[PDB]
Amino acid sequence: SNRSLIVTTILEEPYVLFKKSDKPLYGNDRFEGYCIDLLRELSTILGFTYEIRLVEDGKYGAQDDVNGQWNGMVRELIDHKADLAVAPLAITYVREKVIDFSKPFMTLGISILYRKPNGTNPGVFSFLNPLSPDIWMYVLLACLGVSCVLFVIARFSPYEWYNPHPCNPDSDVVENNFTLLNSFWFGVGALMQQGSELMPKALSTRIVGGIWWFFTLIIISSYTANLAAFLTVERMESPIDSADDLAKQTKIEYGAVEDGATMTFFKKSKISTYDKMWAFMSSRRQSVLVKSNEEGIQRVLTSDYAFLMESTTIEFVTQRNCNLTQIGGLIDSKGYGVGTPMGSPYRDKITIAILQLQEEGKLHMMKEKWWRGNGCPEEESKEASALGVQNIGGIFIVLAAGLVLSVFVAVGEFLYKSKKNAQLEKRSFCSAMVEELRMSLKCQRR
Amino acid sequence: SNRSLIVTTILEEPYVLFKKSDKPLYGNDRFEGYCIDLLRELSTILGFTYEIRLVEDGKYGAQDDVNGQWNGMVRELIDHKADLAVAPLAITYVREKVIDFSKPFMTLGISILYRKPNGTNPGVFSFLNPLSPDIWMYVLLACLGVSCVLFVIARFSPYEWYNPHPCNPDSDVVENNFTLLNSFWFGVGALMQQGSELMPKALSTRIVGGIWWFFTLIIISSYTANLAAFLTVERMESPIDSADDLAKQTKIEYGAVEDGATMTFFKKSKISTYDKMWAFMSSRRQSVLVKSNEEGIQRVLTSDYAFLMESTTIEFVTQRNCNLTQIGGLIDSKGYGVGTPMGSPYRDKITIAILQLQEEGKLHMMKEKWWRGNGCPEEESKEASALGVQNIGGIFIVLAAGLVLSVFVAVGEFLYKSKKNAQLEKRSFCSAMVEELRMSLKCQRR
Amino acid sequence: SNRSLIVTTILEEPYVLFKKSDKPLYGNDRFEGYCIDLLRELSTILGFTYEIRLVEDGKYGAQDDVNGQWNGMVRELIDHKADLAVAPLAITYVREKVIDFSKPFMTLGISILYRKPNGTNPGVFSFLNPLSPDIWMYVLLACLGVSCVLFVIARFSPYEWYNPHPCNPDSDVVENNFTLLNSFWFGVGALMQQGSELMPKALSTRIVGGIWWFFTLIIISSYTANLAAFLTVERMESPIDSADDLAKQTKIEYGAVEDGATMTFFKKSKISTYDKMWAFMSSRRQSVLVKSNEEGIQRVLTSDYAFLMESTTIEFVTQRNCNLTQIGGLIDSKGYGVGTPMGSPYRDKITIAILQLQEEGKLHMMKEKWWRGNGCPEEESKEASALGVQNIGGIFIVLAAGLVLSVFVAVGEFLYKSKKNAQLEKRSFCSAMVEELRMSLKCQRR
Amino acid sequence: SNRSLIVTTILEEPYVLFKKSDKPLYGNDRFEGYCIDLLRELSTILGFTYEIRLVEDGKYGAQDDVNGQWNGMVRELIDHKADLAVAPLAITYVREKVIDFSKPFMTLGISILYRKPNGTNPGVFSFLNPLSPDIWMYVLLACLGVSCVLFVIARFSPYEWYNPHPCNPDSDVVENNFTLLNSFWFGVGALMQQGSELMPKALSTRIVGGIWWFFTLIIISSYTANLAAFLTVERMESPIDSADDLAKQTKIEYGAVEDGATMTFFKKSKISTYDKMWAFMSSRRQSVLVKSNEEGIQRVLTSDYAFLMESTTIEFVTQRNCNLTQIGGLIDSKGYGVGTPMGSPYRDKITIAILQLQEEGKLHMMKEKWWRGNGCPEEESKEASALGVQNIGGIFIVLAAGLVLSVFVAVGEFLYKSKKNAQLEKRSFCSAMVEELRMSLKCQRR
Ligand SMILES: CCCCCCCC/C=C/CCCCCCCC(=O)O[C@@H](COC(=O)CCCCCCCCCCCCCCC)COP(=O)([O-])OCC[N+](C)(C)C
Ligand SMILES: CCCCCCCC/C=C/CCCCCCCC(=O)O[C@@H](COC(=O)CCCCCCCCCCCCCCC)COP(=O)([O-])OCC[N+](C)(C)C
Ligand SMILES: CCCCCCCC/C=C\CCCCCCCC(=O)O[C@@H](COC(=O)CCCCCCCCCCCCCCC)COP(=O)([O-])OCC[N+](C)(C)C
Ligand SMILES: *[C@@H]1O[C@H](CO)[C@@H](O[C@@H]2O[C@H](CO)[C@@H](O)[C@H](O)[C@H]2NC(C)=O)[C@H](O)[C@H]1NC(C)=O
Ligand SMILES: O=S1(=O)NCN(C2CC2)c2ccc(F)cc21
Ligand SMILES: O=S1(=O)NCN(C2CC2)c2ccc(F)cc21
Ligand SMILES: O=S1(=O)NCN(C2CC2)c2ccc(F)cc21
Ligand SMILES: O=S1(=O)NCN(C2CC2)c2ccc(F)cc21
């Protein structure tokens, strides 16, 4: 009970922050957080007393590189104007050459912030998904396949060659409804569940028409059922999944705090994925390198952007906001340790104490208390939105594309018939003008 | 007539009341309720005259650590001023160190108030939901757009002008089937999947019809698959059935009475489901922790609120309001017993007296007299997920709206023909008289 | 530490049973269960010692009614050849007139065993469920309604009266395809998504045919989508829900242990629901009154049967087996109390101790340890079975019913035409025999 | 050359090995692995000659309460026989009271082995699943049954025999369109929802066709709605993603190594999710608690088993077998550090040496050399729920089976006509030669 320990500590949520009460001027119950509850139960097992003191500089600790002078909390650890440094103070090779750390109470690393997938614009078509792109092409090869087979069988079968003119049938003239043009019009019209004016007689052609109807009915039933599975159970998917999946895409842009501890890892890196990721953000400096953590969260939240901070700050923000999520595992491995001056016997005593706190399972109980906030279980039994112009939206393009295609066929049939009239009339001009008159007669017969 | 014993209660209903009548100078006849009928039937089989005396404080009992003493009824019993605390005095641990109970007369626990689930509001025209109102208009404008294109293409195309009357070679006639009215009827018929009496015969008009068929195949499939998504996710909507269901729940807020025995249970609770319920309450103890029981009942009404109180006071106000419903079982387990001073010779005679009334079935009858009144019809079907008139409903209105509209057109077709029939022969009225009788020949031909 | 307490105890799972180990002959760690863990922590707070002793009779305790001699455990509580009776010993008015109980450590009551619903035979039709029985009748009234409206409009419209014989049309004869027979065949054929040979001209009749197609397309889309909601999310429902819902149905039969503590409640009852339930099982004695608990569980499991035992034994068996479930709440209210001789000071000390064990929340931790076994969470995302003959199964009846109905119409048309021939030929015999010859010509023309 | 320090390991791979070669009389060159490369690079930057010496016991270290002493490496360090326990010696609480660690060189935890999800076996002909094989046969027998009834009814009915050739009044002809072949083609066409070229005209045959239409409307709806149920519930099948997912899970059993640090964590655990995992293990500790790590790997293969061991030994054997997959994150948090005797002057020089290798990026490179080899292709698409050739598949086979069957019928129709054509004029072969050239006129008429 001699010389009560001066704990230096910086303010950062959820580690150490003030308590939301009016109730002024009492002190040392003024703070509340993760690094207060851990520090509380260190003096439960050990024996020491407080005066938690905020750092008078507002930094952690770094090099000045002009005189070697230190800053932050670890400047107070050297000249003994502090005793402990229970705070987010990561263990660093530069730091422990002048102070001493305890064994870590939290494990962390560099990870990725990115917006959670939304499903607002699934694609302008987005209806073509319940069948595979192989299957969408294999049914067009089935339509062109069956109709060529149905054309050959209808020509080489005797009972399809029937007697036309069902008004006075007594003759020798024999026609055939299945041309090549009429054979695709069967296979398209049977596919689209609509039927046609022509229906096969002559059982060899009815087996083709019978088995094409059963092929059709499974396709539309499989398309309707699988689309009913998509719209019921929305399973979203992110574009990115890891660092190498983000090291390739150029549309997303990277991001870290300028002159932070995260970009120092990418500058000093040698791994071929992260050497590419630094060459991105070194050339694009003053565009993707933000100057603070809270400003970098906004650029994920406003623009299309990814952010590289520590994993513990990601695990705190993604429990608060539901816009955001974590992408991939951990890149680096670092640890928060209790700062301690050189030679002090309180290093090994807290080192024993943290392992005592861990085997009982209290740090997991501390972490679940301060990082779990309101919680985001918002994914449930998805509230069904109607199909909109962003959802189906693309059958209106292919409808307009078919109508524009058909006008060019209509002019192509307007000229091919007039060229056939040009075999019986003059060159190009008079046969086309008389043909335009028949629509300007505006009548029904002739 | 040994001592004319003095018995203390607290004015809580249904337990004790004032007998609602005029004409004062009552004795112990001014009281009624559950504990008055319990005190009566305990007096008949044990032989003692009771004099009812309300406690001066009005509190049940608790230790104030200022004086280390009790208040209310348990202070009235330790001072030997009155025995027989026949009241809602719950048997808890700290209250039996001071006084002696009997065995309980009312099984009890902590449960959850919540509002009875109102509505779900399916409404008329709820079939119109799986497509947005932009889509229902755009499909309607597509059917009035494609049929205006197919009218123009089939008029300009030469190959649509074919030879009718399938006799009489080449017949000096040509004919266009696709008029203006016949082209809307193609587009409407293809929209409702049932093909019309006429199909295109030229490749220009078979691309318009062929791409309108693919448009309508997606529209009917997207309507059916989304309606299979709306009806599935509202079949998976389960209401709140337990306190564990409230654990993940965030929108509907919890509640308790301030410094009552209910929130006292949550402070001492080691259950992780119940400790998360206190993590809600220890933070936000200004908007959900309400002051009185009657205030929290009003909070369940005009909020999204779930109040936590004793099971008897839940199951009483659910009998008085059809807007409320107990959800969940019983969280705690406790019971009301009568109160006697420490070392009294009466708690054994009452325990045998209470068990005698339980074997006879009195306590189940003595509840229901003061418990249930004007039993609610409750509207309990709740398996009405079978698309009744409440669900689908509106397609019987628009069918009736279409059949009334068609009668107005049938009169308009009757007048327009009879006006043209009176253009040459008849004047105005005798044309309409012979035409109404023309259609009343009850025959098949002419 | 004088005269170590002789605890009498009967064997019943999960309260007290032997431990599954080979390891013979050590004693008093030999037993393990609920009433061992509670009894363990009674001697943690109090001070006393064991020799747990099994009862030498294998009963709880009852009357002989020929000499008043007791049996079971409570026979040993009277003559002091026991000290405690930590066991499932329910508090009874007959029992406490000779011994003393502590305050209860478990609350229980009479409840209902019954088989969990299965969904194996949902009904032989079972396809008629996604539309309400109002809606199934309202579409037949729509078919008969529209076709009568479509018949009247097609007669009273001029443009429907068109020129027949499209082979040489130059005449004055005018026919009409819409008869009364042909008008139902439109409305049936449009309902069944099949079309017909006849298609309306004359726009007033096309508005009827247009709006009937849109009515049809919503019905089949609503039927397919809601059936896709049933088969995805199976929501089972029991026939019975409470005692009064079981006091009405005769197909289920009741059940309790003969000369048990449960049927004594129904014999002595006065409530109008349970007086009816006793008149069932008093007249049907030796048929529904079983002689043991384990034999009564089998009759629920083999036959269609309900069983009336205590709620704690229901809460133990229904955690073991997934065939079984609990129906309704609790009928009676009883309690397990620690037996104690008269005047013994260990009654009030354990009474304080049980309330000490309860406020800390340990009996809930004891009960969740011994009643939760493997657990039955087996309801999940139901593994879809194909539609079988037990599932759809009833369209094969109405198909055969329609074909048998049509043969009687075919004979009715065979006679009505022959009666029309009988107006031109003789009475009944020769016109019917010549008409039978034309099918025996076995040809196609004439 | 100060002392030529002695360093103790344990033969566990990848950490230390034997260098696989012939030619004995090695020194410390007979070892290789992770901790040999760590000991090398710690020797280069700190300047000490190491002599590797395997520990005599082979155990890591634990207290036997018989003697209260340690064994294995931590006994080798307290006795000052050798320093530098460069080995998988995890930093735990009881091991640092005896010896001193450095700061960790490998982040570690407890995770879950589980077999990689094999198959899901969609197979060819999986479209045939939403109806049972009784139903696919009965619908086929219904189409061959109704069409045999409709052949008999339309032959016997007088009203079906109508006048063909719609000119020439009454024409001395009658005609039945419904032959045997034309009646199957009605029933097949109505089955596949696309109406044929002929419809019934009598009320007897319009009830057969009218009730066959209602039969097929239910069959196509029941096929589509069940297929929307199969494809939904296998889209809701999420694999096991956490230990909390194993908590409700019952079929796939847990596992651990006997008396290891993994099950030691579950005994001390106060987490209700992890305590339920020990409720599995404390009962069934003969079938799931296995003796060695290599035995439990074989249990994951040939069982439904989930083994619990350290995260490094999971992530090593998943690199060696493509049949295995780590599921879940990290349950525990712990780490390997090198071991030094209590109060050694080397643990500070090693901690700076370990942090120097972490800043350079050595420890991420020193893993991957001894960690990853022959990287697995992993078959990772896993969003193939879009009905590919694996899913639907088989309707392309039966379409191809129908088109090959129709060619055999077309030859049979060609021979049966040419045999009847050779019944009167030609003999056998020149009839077939002029008929093949009859169909090769490449025209539309004759
Ligand atoms: C009467 C029936 C006669 C059928 C004869 C057909 C002619 C010959 C055609 C040959 C086609 C050759 C090209 C495709 C190759 C097929 C062979 C094959 O791959 O094996 C397939 C199985 O075999 C089947 O399942 C075939 C099913 C055909 C049924 C369709 C009949 C159409 C009737 C139309 C009626 C129209 C009615 C409507 C009009 C009124 C798939 O096998 P696998 O999975 O790859 O491996 C097998 C291993 N295993 C055995 C352990 C599982
Ligand atoms: C161009 C359109 C002209 C329509 C005139 C129809 C004639 C007149 C017919 C009268 C029918 C009388 C009997 C039924 C009673 C209906 C009135 C009623 O109940 O109100 C309903 C609303 O009103 C509607 O929404 C009606 C919708 C009609 C649309 C159908 C047009 C058919 C076009 C055919 C084209 C075929 C094309 C195919 C062929 C080519 C329901 O209201 P509520 O819920 O009970 O309470 C209202 C309270 N609130 C206001 C706050 C919500
Ligand atoms: C003659 C028979 C023809 C059969 C063709 C078979 C189909 C094969 C065709 C294409 C095969 C698939 C290839 C992939 C497409 C490439 C990308 C693409 O073009 O997408 C484009 C649309 O896509 C279309 O427009 C294609 C449809 C053309 C109309 C087909 C009509 C035929 C109807 C058959 C009738 C049968 C009658 C039978 C008569 C006997 C989208 O690109 P975008 O417009 O730039 O996006 C703008 C988005 N924005 C506005 C939001 C900015
Ligand atoms: C069921 O009816 C009640 C009472 O009409 C609705 O309660 C309203 O709740 C809102 C939300 O707090 C209040 O602002 C209103 O004052 C309440 N009373 C009204 C509108 O009279 C309740 O919302 C209904 N249930 C549902 C699901 O809508
Ligand atoms: O700064 S440390 O004490 N030493 C280095 N390491 C390792 C990456 C293995 C780690 C890994 C996780 C920590 F929490 C601490 C440390
Ligand atoms: O205060 S008690 O007499 N003893 C403690 N408990 C129970 C644990 C069941 C209960 C439960 C219900 C009661 F009515 C009384 C009591
Ligand atoms: O046998 S008791 O001690 N006294 C009577 N009752 C009551 C039904 C009120 C109850 C109710 C529940 C119990 F657990 C015990 C008893
Ligand atoms: O044995 S330690 O040095 N101290 C305790 N823990 C932590 C819970 C953070 C960890 C976690 C990961 C490690 F690598 C080392 C340790």
SS3 sequence, B302-345? Answer: CCCECCEEEHHHHHHHHHHCCCEEEECCCCCCEEECCEECCCCC
Would you say A84 and A340 are in contact if contact means Cβ atoms under 8 Å apart? Answer: yes
User: Using CA atoms, how far apart are residues A375 and A318, in angstroms rounded to an integer?
Assistant: 9
Backbone angles phi, psi at D131, to 5 degrees: -130, 145
> How near does any CA of chain C get to the CA of B27, in Å?
34
Would you say D127 and D395 are in contact if contact means Cβ atoms under 8 Å apart? Answer: yes
Would you say B24 and B40 are in contact if contact means Cβ atoms under 8 Å apart? Answer: no
User: Which of D106, D392, D421 should we substitute to test contact with A (largest number of A Cβ atoms within 10 Å)?
Assistant: D392
Between the CA of D104 and the centroid of ligand 8 the distance, in Å, is 8
Ligand nearest to the CA of C353: 6
> Could you tell me if the CB of B402 is within 6 A of ligand 2?
yes
Tokens for D103, please give them.
């700061």
Measured over the CA atoms of residue A265, residue A269, residue A272 and residue A278, the dihedral's sign is: positive
CA D89-D91-D93 angle, 5° bins: 130
Chain B residues with CB within 8 Å of chain D CB: 167, 225, 228, 232, 271-272
The full 3-state SS of B10-48, as one line of letters, equals CCCCCCCCCCCCCCCCCCCCCCCCHHHHHHHHHHHHHCC
Please report how the helices A204-232 and B203-233 are oriented relative to each other, as an axis angle in degrees rounded to 10. 40
Q: Could you count the other beta carbons within 10 Å of the beta carbon of residue B177?
A: 18
Which stretches does DSSP call E strand in B105-214? 106-108, 110-115
Tokens for B444, please give them.
């098949």
SS3 A16: strand
Resolution (A): 3.1
> How near does any CA of chain B get to the CA of D229, in Å?
10
Q: Which residue has a Cα nearest atom 44 of ligand 3?
A: A397
Chain B partners of D275 at a C-beta cutoff of 8 Å?
Answer: none
Tokens for A361, please give them.
């399972």
Q: Which residue has a Cα nearest atom 21 of ligand 4?
A: B302
Ligand nearest to the CA of A147: 3
Backbone angles phi, psi at B23, to 5 degrees: 60, 80
Chain A partners of C228 at a C-beta cutoff of 8 Å?
Answer: 225, 228
DSSP H or E segment with residue C292: none
User: Using CA atoms, how far apart are residues B164 and C166, in angstroms rounded to an integer?
Assistant: 9
Nearest atom in ligand 3 to A125's CA = 41
- Inter-chain contact C406–D205, Cβ cutoff 8 Å? yes
Would you say C325 and C116 are in contact if contact means Cβ atoms under 8 Å apart? Answer: yes
Chain B partners of C219 at a C-beta cutoff of 8 Å?
Answer: 392, 395
Instruction: Find the residue in C nearest to D275 (Cα).
Output: C369
User: Using CA atoms, how far apart are residues B394 and B410, in angstroms rounded to an integer?
Assistant: 24
Q: Could you count the other beta carbons within 10 Å of the beta carbon of residue B381?
A: 6
Q: Could you count the other beta carbons within 10 Å of the beta carbon of residue A204?
A: 26
- Inter-chain contact A208–D402, Cβ cutoff 8 Å? yes
> How near does any CA of chain A get to the CA of B400, in Å?
27
Chain A partners of B130 at a C-beta cutoff of 8 Å?
Answer: 384, 386-387
Nearest atom in ligand 6 to C107's CA = 9
Nearest atom in ligand 1 to D185's CA = 40
Q: Could you count the other beta carbons within 10 Å of the beta carbon of residue B66?
A: 6
Amino acid at B228: A
User: Using CA atoms, how far apart are residues A433 and A419, in angstroms rounded to an integer?
Assistant: 12
Residue A204 contacts by C-beta under 8 Å, 6 or more apart in sequence? A153, A157, D406, D407, D409, D410, D412, D413
Query: Could you give the domains of chain C?
Result: 7-108+335-370 (3.40.190.10), 112-117+239-332 (3.40.190.10), 133-167+174-232 (1.10.287), 395-440 (no CATH)
SS3 C324: strand
Backbone angles phi, psi at C144, to 5 degrees: -70, -25
Tokens for C291, please give them.
């002689």
- Ligand 3 pocket (Cβ < 6 Å) reads A 124, 181, 184-185, 188, 397-398, 401-402, 405; B 203, 206-207, 210-211
Nearest atom in ligand 6 to C106's CA = 9
User: Using CA atoms, how far apart are residues A279 and A189, in angstroms rounded to an integer?
Assistant: 57
Among left, alpha and beta (phi > 0; psi -120 to 50; other), residue C142 is alpha
Q: Which residue has a Cα nearest atom 52 of ligand 1?
A: D124
Q: Which residue has a Cα nearest atom 15 of ligand 8?
A: D335
Residue D62 contacts by C-beta under 8 Å, 6 or more apart in sequence? D70, D71, D72
Q: End-to-end CA distance of chain B, in Å?
A: 111
- The technique is cryo-EM
Q: In 3D, which of A55, A93, A58 has the Cα closest to residue A77?
A: A55
Between the CA of B91 and the centroid of ligand 6 the distance, in Å, is 8
Tokens for C24, please give them.
């013979």
DSSP H or E segment with residue C18: strand C17-18
Beta bridge partners, D51, equal D6
- Ligand 7 pocket (Cβ < 6 Å) reads B 103-107, 354-355, 358, 363; C 91, 104, 107, 333-335
Residue B37 contacts by C-beta under 8 Å, 6 or more apart in sequence? B366, B369, B370
User: Which of B214, B235, B282 should we substitute to test contact with A (largest number of A Cβ atoms within 10 Å)?
Assistant: B214
Residue B234 contacts by C-beta under 8 Å, 6 or more apart in sequence? B120, B385
Between the CA of A189 and the centroid of ligand 1 the distance, in Å, is 26
Ligand nearest to the CA of B300: 4
Instruction: Find the residue in C nearest to B384 (Cα).
Output: C132
Chain A partners of C195 at a C-beta cutoff of 8 Å?
Answer: 195
DSSP H or E segment with residue B50: strand B50-54
> Could you tell me if the CB of B321 is within 6 A of ligand 4?
no
User: Which of B360, B395, B416, B433 should we substitute to test contact with C (largest number of C Cβ atoms within 10 Å)?
Assistant: B395
- Inter-chain contact A386–B132, Cβ cutoff 8 Å? yes
